[PDB]
């Protein structure tokens, strides 16, 4: 069980991947292969992956998952030591944790595990064993279970730079290449409208400022072309409106200046 | 030495580094740990740099240093190596290599390692020795050290896709806020010029064509703070125009009509 306990956790390790990137799925082979409780915590205490394995009743886990957040001094003291710890509980070989908070280790043979998945430090991987101690073939996995999570913290937060950052730019790259009419079109079309969606006249809103009628069509022959929306435009009843892009609404409100 | 000589490889781990990747040095910190030849061959079958110390007899590992590329059948053959099988010279075990292509292992005990990463094949990292074999603890350094060769492949090509994407795009954005007139200026500016570095008069250049100077004032005061050109705006006498952007006026050539 040195080459077989690392070959069922692999049937779960994903690199970015298509199916939902979720920590509430990441410790599947860390409960019956490590056979130990798994906590996946990020830098300053913010919870994205939880779940105790065995019913151990402490007074900082009976009120902790109740908040979904590490409190006051659980943001400045869970991010200091360069490496792991051997056999943590009410006893500690040295000053493992501050004398103000010796209570995170009262219920379990706990093991705070460092995530090093890119040449850095990604929060914590807090374990808490019932009776059995951490020895040989269930310690390397408690460490390996931190980087089976560490190909996904920069894959549930690095989808926050590829999709979230881009969507701003395109929703500007299309707006940039608009002449004044079409730029006054889409600004009056989506302000005098049903917040989210819309459906009204084809060109009765057109020349009530001074603009023309058919320049309204090509204004939409921009968004549809750059790549923002879908609209089954009827030549018999105005037109159809429903957004596709997720970040266009905000960059439409804050434009009154 | 399975965690002390690994801080000569995990500490070599320079994520993107910060300097335009050098590829022989990346093949030198695998030479001061396992102690062997290094051949960082990528996916298409090309070569980038080599750290060889001892003189070993070889046949097509020396037409791979001259050409830097394999002819005909190797790109097909070494495309079919899944993981890390240990020690294959003139004698393997199954149908791993053709007999006509078997001359890649003749002399010495060479152990080929694939560079798997991100969920795809990136190439073969070739290591060859003379009279020492890759033992029970000499090759997981080429397994954990094949997870990160692709790092500076998804950081070097990743600073030649975002680096290129941004270019051709910024090269276009500026083009946009240039009204047809303001464009006409650019079409005349670079066409009558010597080399990349060119400069001539303020009053003349304009109505020589017919255009005003006023729409070169603001026209070249767009690409200025946009991010395309630097030019010391001497209102006393014209100005000198050098580009901040490379493949930019190459977008001016093909877009004639």
From Swiss-Prot, chains A, B:
Cross-referenced Pfam families: CodY (PF06018), HTH_CodY (PF08222)
Residues annotated to bind GTP: 50, 68
Modified residue annotations for Phosphoserine: 214
Residue span of region GAF domain: 1-154
Effect of residue 213 to E: Does not bind the ilvB and dpp promoters
Result after altering residue 60 to A: Retains some ilvB repressing activity in a BCAA-containing medium. Retains the ability to respond to GTP, but responds poorly to branched-chain amino acids unless GTP is simultaneously present
Portion annotated as DNA-binding: 202-221
Gene3D superfamilies, per the entry: 3.30.450.40, Winged helix-like DNA-binding domain superfamily/Winged helix DNA-binding domain
Consequence recorded when altering residue 214 to T/A: Slightly reduced affinity for ilvB and dpp promoters
Keyword Transcription regulation: yes
Stored PANTHER family: GLOBAL TRANSCRIPTIONAL REGULATOR CODY, GTP-SENSING TRANSCRIPTIONAL PLEIOTROPIC REPRESSOR CODY
Domain observations: Modular protein made up of an N-terminal effector binding GAF-type domain and a C-terminal wHTH DNA binding domain, separated by a helical linker. The GAF domain is involved in the formation of homodimers. Amino acid binding to the GAF domain is associated with drastic but localized changes in structure. Structural changes upon isoleucine binding may lead to increased affinity of Ile-bound CodY for its target DNA.
Quaternary context: Homodimer. Homotetramer. Homodimer under physiological conditions, but homotetramers are observed in the crystals.
Name the record gives this protein: Global transcriptional regulator CodY
Organism: Bacillus subtilis (strain 168)
Upper lineage: Bacteria, Bacillati, Bacillota, Bacilli, Bacillales
């Amino acid at each position: 069980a040195l080459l077989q306990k690392t070959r069922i956790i692999n049937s779960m390790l994903q690199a970015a991947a298509g199916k939902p990137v979720n920590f509430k799925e990441m410790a599947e082979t860390l409960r019956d292969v490590i056979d130990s409780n798994i906590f996946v915590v990020s830098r300053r205490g913010k919870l994205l992956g939880y779940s105790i394995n065995q019913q151990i009743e402490n007074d900082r886990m009976k009120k902790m998952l109740e908040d979904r957040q590490f409190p006051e001094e659980y943001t400045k003291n869970l991010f200091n030591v360069p490496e792991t710890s051997s056999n943590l509980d009410i006893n500690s070989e040295y000053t493992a944790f501050p004398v103000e908070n010796r209570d995170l280790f009262q219920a379990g043979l706990t093991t705070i595990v460092p995530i090093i998945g890119g040449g850095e430090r990604l929060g914590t991987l807090i374990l808490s064993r019932l009776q059995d101690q951490f020895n040989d073939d269930d310690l390397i996995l408690a460490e390996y279970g931190a980087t089976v999570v560490g190909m996904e913290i920069l894959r549930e937060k690095a989808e926050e730079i590829e999709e979230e950052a881009r969507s701003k730019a395109v929703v500007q790259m299309a707006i940039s290449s608009l002449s004044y009419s079409e730029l006054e079109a889409i600004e009056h079309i989506f302000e005098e409208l049903d917040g989210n969606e819309g459906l009204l006249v084809a060109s009765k809103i057109a020349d009530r400022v001074g603009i023309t009628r058919s320049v309204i069509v090509n204004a939409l022959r921009k968004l549809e072309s750059a790549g923002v929306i879908e609209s089954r435009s009827l030549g018999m009843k105005g037109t159809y409106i429903k957004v596709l892009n997720n970040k266009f609404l905000i960059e439409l409100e804050n434009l009154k200046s």
